[PDB]
Input
Amino acid sequence: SHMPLLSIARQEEEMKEQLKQMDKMKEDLAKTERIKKELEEQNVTLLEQKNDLFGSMKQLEDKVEELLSKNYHLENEVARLKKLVGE
Amino acid sequence: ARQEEEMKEQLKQMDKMKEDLAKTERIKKELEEQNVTLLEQKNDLFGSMKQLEDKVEELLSKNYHLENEVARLKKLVGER
Output
């Protein structure tokens, strides 16, 4: 209250306003902590999932490299065989 | 004076409270940015994953065709 209060009354109004603001902070903290913990857990999971996608990525790049080389060698054999028969 | 002391104690507890909250919010926002960046990196990886799988399927099918073409040609040439 902004009305002119007497010390005895202002004091009581101030103490109530403090407990209130305190409970508000206790609530803001509890919620932020909860959200913080869920974020920790999720990031751990995401990181683990990302490292797995990287691992799969590599296996595939390798598979592609292996197939690209067998492909070129095949096109060269076809060209060699074709020229020999005349196509 | 006695009530003024009760006020001070409440304030010391309050300061500590704001301190724990400020700290918790700072770590939280940090974790949020790390969380969004990871989500995006995971999305990137999926998209690149598909491209590669398609390339593999394509190369595997060309490979088999080429092997059949090489087989056909050898039978004509006499090679074994």
Notes: The helical segments of chain B are 2-77.
